[PDB]
Write a protein that binds this DNA or RNA. Structure first.
Ligand SMILES: [Zn+2]
Ligand SMILES: [Zn+2]
Ligand SMILES: [Zn+2]
Ligand SMILES: [Zn+2]
Ligand SMILES: [Zn+2]
Lengths: 49, 556, 82, 115, 67, 98, 257, 574, 44, 71, 92
RNA sequence: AAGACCAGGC
DNA sequence: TCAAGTACTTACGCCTGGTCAT
């Protein structure tokens, strides 16, 4: 173990990858939420190009 | 040199045509928070005792009591009866009430008319409300704009604001010896529509309009038409708004240039021009040239002849009576004002096609080396000059054609001839042609290799490739025209966002250069070191507020 | 300077008017005797205004010239614009 | 936070008189009526009724501020005819018209239903 | 969110017409015909159902706080 | 902590070198509206200074056609500098040129 | 200086709409009658809501606002009821209010539509216009909604919940003879439902001697009051306002003189 | 190109640029290059055939997608410097056809020219009929419009969350809003808008709203505020505990009411909380207890919606309390259409007071006609016309930018088929008097947005409250009960007024007033013991000649800072 | 003090100075079980 | 700054425009004195600036007070 | 408040001589200790010197009636081991 | 407790 | 004396809020 890399939501290594809308609602996640942001200490951070 | 202050309020501003020029609408919460300390006298001891009894809870109440010792009795928290005793010399900090003098500001404060003293009028809801003629001095509009409320805390500063900074006292600026306030927006448009010959009013309509005239003597004037039915004219009612006996001559926007030379000079076939004799609107249709903020306007003459107090009533009465008449006539904007005739559209298309053919001919001359360079210009420079000349002439011709097609009922033309909002170029772009889009004063640059967009071939100097929008806003822009229009408007957005800092820096530099320069008691203008900047202010010793434009009549 | 040879405007300036009005209003609010007969006037600012119209404010305006000299003008000696 | 209560447009609070009669000193036989908690529904109808009176020289109404709830009706009449008398006559006129209209509307409803 | 009662402009009851509108759309009717079948004549009433988005159905996909 | 700090504060670099570190990266995601969230998730930044009065980098270049929205630009000190992606715009993820 | 004698001709009379024409009256009188249709016609509506349980996806004030907009049949007991301000009782009493009870819980997997039919009134006559059903909220399994509501007597001036009518159609001078509106192009304006001119002509010739009369009405009830009762209540309320103003004016005249 | 089209050796990301004049072929595989798909034109024909479209129509249960289209060599990703060498056709059926020849060597075609717009600019109906600054303003404003920002907003404990009561999808929509998910999560209501001058309260940019419509739920919204609090163990014995404080157990205490807290010091949801009420009760053990409770933001007046208890990373007690407040649109709230026409609510009129059509229609919003001519948002007018057509027809209007099949005349002809004037004008009656308005008013359903900017969140008033620790001047910020800044420009303006006393009040009296005792010999401040009356100047042995000087506290701070830099700013009263 | 779990939605009673952990599920996010005291809502 | 700070004005007037600490260091090194005749200088020390309503002085006339009412 | 109220008619600038700084300074011998507190109370000769001003906002200055508002603060000094150039005066 | 940054408003 | 370097500074008004780490 060398560290923890913050995971972008709905990415390949996110837990919401490949989940159906029913599965997403089961986790209280919006199916229309595009993801693409990180959660750091609860706050949602988006990296600007 | 600047700091945060107590007794200050900020909230969004919303219009109120029913307030006076010097009045400001203030929400109850703000007035219940802001307090003015008033020294108790045997004249006001009972009123201030009642205010103390009401306390901080009831709005027309008080928050603190200041004794002669300087100790402050708080009235916000269940005070003890003995501490509510008011003997002469105490200062009770009463809540701000109607008629209180406040300083009203909208940052940035560019000139001294951007921070004027108003008169408090308590109104429901939570916004500051100011009359629409006071919008121009503050450069304000009611889309999320916020203004500051500074409440003077002493009788001396209250009198200072009342005698110096009151809105009616700031009507005419010394900057340009012109009014800063004028009749604007709906009131201006409805004045223009109300001052035409065709406006005949019924008896009840005249009575309702007169109910909104504060300076009315109570005598209903005899109508212009007595038989077969009584009918008052719009000019007849407006003449009752004009203060005193004002003598003024102006011209309407649509005034032809042949009327003064030929006959009907004093009859005005189009009812244009403007004549106000003895405070009576004898003839003419009013617009921004008569009620606007310009030299020699009717409001300017009202200030220069009657004074600030009666000019304030002039403004407010115009606003109220004209809005209430517009309640009958109404004003709108729709698609029908953006639509021209079929013949006008064909004429515009013929003009645009001719312009494009002319540009093609110029391009062919340039490609064949037949373009002789104008002296002082290169071949590319003279080619661009010719192309811009052709395109500008085309857009002017199309704009004239679109303007001539507008009926007297057209609302674009209605707001343009009144001066309330818009110009002939807006009508031309909406109806006829948007026009050439320029970046840095030149046609749309070749961002790509020798082409403006990938959709054009290289070395395409025609109007379409370089940013000439053949379509109008009503017609809608093509994708290339859409992108070129976006590029053109981006420059204006950049200029707007970048001008503020440099202009503010220049203004600060000027103010630091001349902050201590003042007119001394021997009429000499001196700095802080008593060095004579000017022997007489303006070399004539006059203030810039009272001077007017005049002609020598002996020169030339 | 003395009363004679006063070289200044006989008119009361707007700044002088404002400050005299505020000062007199403050004095009235602090129980100063009113020089004019008031008819149901309880606002010290308005009483100061009506004293100004009556040329009754007991204030001398000291106008400092840039050379350090001064001229004392009574409010009644100055002609009010209003 | 400064929202006035919704009943503040028709309810009279303590000490607020419904109608106040004040003479107008500019013109003879002219009066000003201040109606509290009233709006265009009564003001316009009273102004229109007063204009039907040949002895009413002037009849107008206005709301000084829409955010406030008050009506000012200015009535001027001929000599030897008080504006208060004209106001009372106009109100009685309106009540008589409304009663006749209600009776005729009820008769029309009865005629339309099974008739 | 949910079909509003009392159409904003005029005040006609449109809260009882959402399910009927959905059924009429589902079986035969076009939207214009379905609005006429429900008696929604004024376009103020028509835009209430025509422009309505029923987010409450998506909100019912979430489990309640208490079982 | 390096990843968490740089994503949290937005100062892209070492915490001790925050001044030499570029700031403004990793904004807090805007949840005011869904359109706002989409705009924040598709947004480009020009690293040049906002206080700069140079108007050329703020201008809408012809090459932004189909790549950057010609209309969505932060009105204010970031005009032309903060830009947003077009709907069809895609950004290359990289490949080995072997 | 006396009252005009108005006449009424009723053309359409349904359970939802009353279309009638009033002749020989002022425009101000007609417009005031129209305003009272919306503003000053008393009607019973829910104004006091207390919620015991609300597990639905809509918060408490959402469902309270939806409940207040539900019309209730107030045909006859609205006149018997007294305003809660004028009532001697504290809080609410049957002489000033009608109590409502709602208790819905979704136990089945199928969605539960909470409708106005689930509103239960203590009075057999005040019913939420259910002799479809107005949707209050949709309940997933495990979601519950229990509340108590009191229905007060009010008019549309206080709140739009007490507006007894849908869109009140009002019209005078169908063919433009008084020229109260001027058409820049009269030929492109659709002819009114009450137009009496031929297809060839667009507007009637100008009538200088004419005045607004023969006002065309179409009052559409929302079900709280019968559409014919709306006009009766409006006339009675306008007359009541005039009578109260007359009483106070007479008192003022006697006091000041 | 053949390899990239077939995806054999060159992936679609790779860009290949041939500079013919400079004899250079540049191939780029690196990341960061911005590219967009374009159809491929071979000869003068599109490679996109009818079979591709037929296969895509059956995209479900066919395993045919965009990747199949790219792998078939029909579409191609082209970046900017390769777009330099491309010859693009805007539309196929217009630019590849044989006509008066302009270009015959087209190599690519636009999929659709509306794809140049981003997310926020794609919600604009008829953007090509608007002035570009208005499109930019609407693009900025759309991120500020309120709707249902996310479907799981119930589980989200987000600070400053706004949700709309009745979001509606636009009656006039763009073909891109389907891909923007705007129909699912819309921010705005189709409002019957009359562009009219009614009573002057819509003048400038302000709007007049229907009070009756607002009562019926028109543009009602909810504001959610989440408060976070955390127990902690910092000192050896210092700790934080969530509990309901008693009257005398905590050293610090506020005049607020703690009776709403539970045994855990947390208010239960459903409890109506006004300003100054305590949200979370926390105590600090002082090395008895010190109050660290959290209170509401001033004048919120909401109701607790949800309270969450958990453990944070450190395992300590962590609480998030969400307070909901319903915000009825007042006369200070900000509204805008999708065309940059922003404005506040000038006033609200009820249904009887609003102008009404012959059918009883009263506009929900009245906007001034003066906002249109200079700002030239013709797309607003066309949107209103198309919305009027679509509401009566029953369809949703198509306002995709460059259509060439949706003209204003066609919309007018469609409107004329439903008994309305083709230009959208309608005869209105004055609500107050019942009289016809002489000018016919342009009325139709226009999609409007309620912006985050509300008057209650922006209204502030200061009267002698908190001051800064260092400057002793009024605090900064509405949240900190701060005072407005009387800046240098305001000072210059008051100098121009010649208002020396008001200037002194603002810069000396209203802000920090202060007194110091300076020596008379030197100008340096002296030790002044007022109670003992022993005034001494260390440095002159001056106990007799010491003067009292009234100066702003910031000036004393400046002089002390100058003395800290060895400067002697000697204030001389002689 | 009854808390509602956010995962299994069961009611558990915990006191002060007790770690948040739902029985039979082991979930550390709970909710406050809306109060019994009734608040009047104006149907406006 | 080059031109406004070169005028023979007080160091406090200059320190209000674009140099501040440098101007005050120069004044301290050379013993410059500020005559307090400007507007910025008086504003900094919270004194009535010699602007309008501050450029003159008010005196009480005792003779004119000998006409007062409620004394 | 027994001292007469005066207006500043002139501000004389100059450099604080070390002798004047030492005479003016309220700490005797200078600030020798960099610690603010050593036993929970402010140490004399440290950065937080009660002779230098008011602490805790409810206490009183050691040199005057402080009240945390009436106390204008008093100057201390540090006697440098060796002379050090003044950055502001280095060019001069 | 007040700094840094960020976003926004006019 | 000069004049060409090189170091060295200096441009946003007001307002909101949020978050983060000392
Ligand atoms: Zn409707
Ligand atoms: Zn009762
Ligand atoms: Zn000394
Ligand atoms: Zn659990
Ligand atoms: Zn001390």
């Amino acid at each position: 173990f060398i560290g923890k890399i913050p995971i972008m939501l709905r990415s390949t290594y996110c837990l919401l990858n490949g989940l159906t809308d029913r599965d997403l609602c089961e986790l209280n996640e919006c199916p229309l939420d595009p993801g693409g942001y990180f959660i750091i200490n609860g706050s949602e951070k988006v990296l600007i190009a | 040199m600047g700091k945060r202050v107590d007794f200050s309020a900020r909230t969004v501003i919303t219009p109120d045509p029913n307030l006076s020029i010097d009045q400001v609408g203030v929400p109850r919460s703000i007035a219940a928070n802001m307090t003015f300390a008033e020294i108790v006298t045997p004249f006001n001891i009972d009123r201030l005792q009642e205010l103390v009894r009401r306390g901080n809870s009831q709005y027309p109440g008080a928050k603190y009591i200041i004794r002669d010792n300087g100790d402050r009795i708080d009235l916000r928290f269940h005070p003890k009866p003995s501490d509510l005793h008011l003997q002469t010399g105490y200062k009770v900090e009463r809540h701000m009430c109607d008629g209180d003098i406040v300083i009203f500001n909208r940052q940035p404060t560019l000139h001294k008319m951007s921070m004027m003293g108003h008169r408090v009028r308590i109104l429901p809801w939570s916004t500051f409300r100011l009359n629409l003629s006071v919008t121009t001095p503050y450069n304000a509009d009611f889309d999320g704009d916020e203004m500051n409320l500074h409440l003077p805390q002493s009788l001396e500063t209250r009198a200072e604001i009342q005698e110096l900074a009151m809105v009616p006292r700031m009507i005419v600026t010394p900057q340009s010896n012109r009014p800063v306030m004028g009749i604007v927006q709906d009131t201006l448009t409805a004045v223009r529509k109300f001052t035409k010959r065709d406006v005949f009013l019924e008896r009840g309509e005249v009575m309702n309009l007169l109910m909104f005239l504060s300076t009315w003597d109570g005598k209903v004037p005899q109508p212009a038409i007595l038989k077969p039915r009584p009918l008052w004219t719009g000019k007849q009612i407006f003449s009752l708004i004009i203060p005193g006996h004002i003598n003024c001559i102006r011209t309407h926007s649509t005034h032809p240039d042949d009327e003064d030379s030929g006959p009907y000079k004093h009859i005005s076939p189009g009812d244009t021009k403007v004549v106000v004799e003895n405070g009576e609107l004898i003839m003419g249709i009013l617009c921004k040239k008569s009620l606007g903020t310009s030299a020699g306007s009717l409001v300017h003459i009202s200030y220069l002849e009657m004074g600030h107090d009666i000019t304030r009533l002039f403004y407010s009465n115009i606003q109220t009576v004209i809005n209430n008449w517009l309640l009958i006539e109404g004003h709108t904007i729709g698609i029908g004002d953006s639509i021209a005739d079929s013949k006008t559209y064909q004429d515009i298309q013929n003009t645009i096609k001719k312009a494009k053919q002319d540009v093609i001919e110029v391009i062919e001359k340039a490609h064949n080396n037949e373009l002789e360079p104008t002296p002082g210009n290169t071949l590319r420079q003279t080619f661009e000059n010719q192309v811009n000349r052709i395109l500008n002439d085309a857009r002017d011709k199309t704009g004239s054609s679109a303007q001539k097609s507008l009926s007297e009922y057209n609302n674009f033309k209605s707001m343009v001839v009144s001066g309330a909002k818009g110009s002939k170029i807006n009508i031309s772009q909406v109806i006829a042609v948007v026009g050439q889009q320029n970046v840095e004063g030149k046609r749309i640059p070749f961002g790509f290799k020798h082409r403006t967009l990938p959709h054009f071939i290289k070395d395409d100097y025609g109007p379409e490739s370089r940013g000439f929008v053949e379509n109008s806003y009503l017609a809608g822009l093509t994708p290339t025209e859409f992108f070129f229009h976006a590029m053109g408007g981006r420059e204006g957005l950049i200029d707007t966002a970048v001008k503020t800092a440099e202009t503010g820096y220049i203004q600060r530099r000027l103010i630091k250069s001349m902050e201590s320069v003042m007119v001394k008691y021997d009429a000499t203008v001196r700095n802080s070191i008593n060095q004579v900047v000017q022997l007489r202010y303006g070399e004539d010793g006059l203030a810039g507020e009272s001077v007017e434009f005049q002609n020598l009549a002996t020169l030339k | 300077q003395a009363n004679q040879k006063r070289i200044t405007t006989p008119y009361m300036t707007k700044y002088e008017r404002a400050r005299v009005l505020g000062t007199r209003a403050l004095q009235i609010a602090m129980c100063a005797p009113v020089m004019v007969e008031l008819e149901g006037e309880t606002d010290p600012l308005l009483i100061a205004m009506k004293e100004l119209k009556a040329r009754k404010i007991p204030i001398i305006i000291r106008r400092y010239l840039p050379d350090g000299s001064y001229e004392d003008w009574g409010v009644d000696e100055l002609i009010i614009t209003d | 936070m400064n929202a006035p209560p919704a009943f503040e447009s028709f309810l009279l609070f303590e000490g607020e008189k419904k109608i106040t009669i004040n003479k107008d000193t500019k013109v003879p036989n002219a009066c000003l009526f201040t109606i509290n908690k009233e709006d265009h529904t009564l003001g316009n109808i009273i102004k229109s009724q007063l204009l039907k009176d040949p002895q009413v020289l002037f009849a107008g109404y206005k709301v000084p501020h829409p955010l406030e709830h008050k009506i000012i009706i200015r009535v001027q009449t001929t000599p030897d005819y008080s504006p208060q008398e004209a106001f009372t006559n106009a109100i009685t006129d309106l009540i008589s018209e409304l009663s006749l209209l209600e009776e005729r509307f009820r008769v029309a409803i009865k005629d339309k239903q099974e008739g | 969110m949910i079909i509003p009662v009392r159409c904003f402009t005029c005040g006609k009851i449109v809260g009882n017409k959402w399910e009927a509108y959905l059924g009429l759309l589902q079986a035969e009717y076009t939207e214009g015909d379905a609005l006429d079948a429900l008696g929604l004549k004024r376009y103020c009433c028509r835009r209430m159902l025509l422009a309505h988005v029923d987010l409450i159905e998506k909100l019912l996909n979430y489990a309640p706080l208490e079982k | 902590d390096g990843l968490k700090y740089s994503l949290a504060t937005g100062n892209w670099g070492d915490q001790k070198k925050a001044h030499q570190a570029r700031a403004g990266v990793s904004q807090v995601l805007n949840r005011l509206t869904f359109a706002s969230t989409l705009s924040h998730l598709r947004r480009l930044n020009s690293p040049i200074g906002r206080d700069g009065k140079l108007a050329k980098p703020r201008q809408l270049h012809n090459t932004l056609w189909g790549m950057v929205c010609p209309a969505e630009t932060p009105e204010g000190h970031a005009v032309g500098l903060v830009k947003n992606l077009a709907l069809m715009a895609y950004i290359s993820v990289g490949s080995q040129p072997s | 200086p006396y009252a005009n004698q108005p006449t009424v001709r009723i053309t359409e009379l349904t359970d939802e709409n009353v279309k009638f024409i009033i002749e020989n009256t002022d425009l101000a009188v007609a417009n005031s009658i129209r305003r009272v249709f919306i503003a000053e016609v008393p009607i019973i509506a829910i104004d006091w809501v207390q919620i015991d349980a609300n597990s639905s996806v809509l918060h408490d004030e959402f469902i309270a606002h939806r409940l207040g907009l539900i019309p209730l049949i107030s045909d006859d007991i609205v006149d018997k009821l007294q305003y809660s301000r004028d009532c001697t009782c504290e809080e609410f009493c049957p002489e000033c209010s009608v109590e409502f009870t709602l208790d819905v819980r979704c136990n089945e997997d199928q969605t539960r539509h909470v409708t106005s039919r689930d509103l239960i009134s203590n009075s057999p006559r005040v019913i939420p216009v259910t002799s479809d059903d107005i949707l209050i909220v949709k309940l997933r399994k495990g979601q519950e909604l229990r509340l108590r509501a009191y229905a007060k007597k009010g008019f549309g001036k206080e709140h739009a919940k007490w507006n007894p009518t849908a869109g009140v159609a009002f019209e005078y001078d169908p063919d433009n003879a008084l020229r109260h509106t001027v058409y820049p192009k009269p030929e492109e304006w659709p002819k009114s439902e009450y137009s009496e001119l031929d297809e060839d002509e667009s507007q009637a010739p100008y009538d200088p001697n004419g005045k607004p009369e023969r006002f065309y009405y179409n009052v559409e009830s929302c079900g709280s009051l019968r559409p014919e009762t709306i006009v009766l209540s409006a006339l009675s309320g306008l007359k009541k306002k005039l009578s109260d103003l007359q009483t106070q004016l007479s008192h003022e005249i006697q006091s000041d003189v | 190109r053949k390899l990239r089209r077939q995806m054999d050796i060159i992936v679609s990301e790779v860009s290949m640029i041939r500079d013919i004049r400079e004899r250079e072929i540049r191939i780029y595989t690196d990341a960061g290059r911005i590219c967009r798909p374009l159809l491929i034109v071979e000869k003068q024909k599109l490679l996109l055939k009818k079979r591709h479209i037929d296969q895509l129509k059956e995209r479900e249960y066919n395993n045919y997608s965009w990747q199949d289209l790219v792998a078939s060599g029909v579409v191609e990703y082209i970046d900017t410097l390769e777009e330099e060498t491309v010859m693009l056709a805007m539309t196929p059926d217009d630019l590849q056809e044989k006509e008066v020849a302009y270009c015959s060597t087209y190599t690519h075609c636009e999929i659709h020219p509306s794809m140049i717009l981003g997310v926020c600019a794609s919600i604009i109906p008829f953007p090509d009929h608007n002035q570009s600054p208005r499109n930019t303003y609407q693009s900025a404003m759309g991120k500020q419009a309120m709707g249902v920002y996310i479907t799981n907003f119930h589980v989200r404990m987000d600070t400053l969350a706004h949700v709309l009561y009745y979001p509606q999808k636009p009656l006039v929509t763009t073909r891109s809003m389907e891909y923007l998910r705007f129909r699912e999560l819309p921010a705005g209501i189709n409002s019957i808008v009359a562009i009219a001058s009614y009573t002057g309260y819509n003048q400038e940019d302000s709007v007049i709203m229907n009070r009756s419509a607002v009562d019926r739920g028109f543009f009602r919204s909810v504001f959610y505020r989440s408060y976070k609090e955390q127990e902690s163990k910092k000192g050896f014995d210092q700790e934080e505990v969530f509990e309901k404080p008693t009257r005398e157990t905590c050293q610090g205490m506020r005049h607020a009411i703690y009776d709403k807290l539970d045994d855990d010091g947390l208010i239960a949801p459903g409890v109506r909380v006004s300003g100054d009420d305590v949200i979370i009760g926390k105590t600090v053990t002082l090395p008895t207890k010190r109050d660290c409770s959290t209170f509401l933001r001033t004048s919120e007046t909401g109701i607790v919606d949800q309270v969450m208890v958990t453990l944070n990373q450190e395992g300590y007690k962590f609480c998030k309390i969400r307070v909901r407040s319903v915000r009825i649109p007042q006369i200070g709230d900000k509204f805008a259409s999708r065309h940059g026409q922003k404005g506040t609510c000038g006033i609200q009129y009820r249904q009887e007071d609003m102008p009404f059509t012959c059918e009883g229609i009263t506009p929900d919003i009245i906007i001034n006609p003066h906002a249109i001519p200079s700002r030239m948002t013709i797309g607003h007018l066309i949107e209103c016309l198309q919305g009027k057509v679509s509401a009566n027809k029953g369809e949703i209007g198509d306002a995709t930018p460059f259509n060439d099949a949706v003209n204003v005349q066609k919309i007018s002809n469609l409107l004329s088929d439903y008994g309305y004037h083709l230009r959208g004008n309608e005869v209105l009656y004055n609500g107050f008097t019942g009289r016809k308005i002489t000018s016919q008013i342009f009325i139709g359903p226009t999609y409007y947005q309620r912006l985050k900017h509300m008057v209650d969140d922006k209204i502030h008033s200061r009267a002698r409250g908190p001051i800064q620790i260092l400057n002793r001047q009024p605090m900064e910020g509405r949240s900190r009960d701060g005072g407005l800044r009387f800046g240098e420009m305001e000072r210059d303006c008051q100098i121009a007024h010649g208002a020396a006393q008001f200037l002194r009040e603002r810069l000396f009296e209203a802000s920090d007033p202060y007194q110091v005792h300076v020596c008379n010999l030197c100008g340096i401040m002296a030790i002044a013991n007022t109670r003992t009356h022993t005034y001494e100047c260390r440095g002159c042995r001056n106990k007799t000649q010491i003067s009292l000087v009234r100066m702003p506290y910031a000036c004393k701070l400046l002089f002390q800072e100058l003395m800290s830099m060895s400067i002697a700013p000697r204030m001389m009263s002689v | 003090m009854i808390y509602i779990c956010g995962e299994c939605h069961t009611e558990n009673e915990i006191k002060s100075r007790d770690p948040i952990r739902c029985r039979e599920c082991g979930y550390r996010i709970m909710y406050k079980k809306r109060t019994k005291r009734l608040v009047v809502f104006d149907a406006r | 700054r080059h031109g406004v700070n070169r005028q023979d004005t007080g160091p406090l007037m200059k320190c209000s425009f674009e140099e501040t600490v440098d101007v005050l260091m120069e004044a301290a090194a050379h013993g410059e004195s500020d005559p307090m005749k400007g507007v910025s200088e008086n504003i900094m020390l919270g004194q009535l600036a010699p602007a309008g309503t501050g450029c003159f002085d008010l005196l009480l006339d005792a003779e004119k007070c000998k006409y007062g009412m409620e004394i | 408040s027994a001292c007469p109220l005066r207006t500043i008619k002139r501000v004389q600038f100059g450099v604080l001589s070390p002798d004047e700084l030492k005479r003016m300074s309220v700490t005797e011998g200078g600030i020798k200790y960099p610690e603010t507190t050593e036993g929970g109370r402010p140490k004399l000769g440290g950065l937080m010197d009660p002779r230098q001003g008011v602490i805790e906002r409810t206490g009183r200055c050691q040199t005057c009636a402080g009240n945390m508002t009436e106390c204008p603060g008093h100057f201390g000094h540090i006697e440098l081991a060796k002379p050090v150039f003044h950055v502001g005066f280095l060019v001069k």
